[PDB]
Structure 1
Amino acid sequence: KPHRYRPGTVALREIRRYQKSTELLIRKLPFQRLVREIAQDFKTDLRFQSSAVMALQEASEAYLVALFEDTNLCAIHAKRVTIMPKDIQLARRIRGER
């Protein structure tokens, strides 16, 4: 009988790991393609500094992480442990983004 951790052990291990580390969590080339594609709609033939893309990714990831913390609070408020789109929407509504 092969070893299996129970459903939540590896999740908590991941939480500890990624709250311990600081490296970016999105892949850099996919994120850069996303940025360039979004910027295409505002002006054609735009160039980007490497540091401009890195600053965009730092900010985007900090924003998404803080949003996930608020979302986790809203999911716990409803006596769940599973974050859901309604949690995300409530968090962004209370923040004043929707």
Structure 2
Amino acid sequence: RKSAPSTGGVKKPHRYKPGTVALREIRRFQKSTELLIRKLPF
């Protein structure tokens, strides 16, 4: 025989990306200018 079933069908590489850039920016650039309450209520 060989392999009658399978022969692939679905494969997908993924995971990470959104947080990597944020962490590299944080490590290579400090963070400041924190959140302020909405202007119109004040």
- TM above 0.5, one fold? no
TM bucket by the smaller chain? 0.3 to 0.5
TM-score of the superposition, structure 1-length normalised?
0.20
More helix by share: 1
More strand by share: 1
TM-score of the superposition, structure 2-length normalised?
0.35
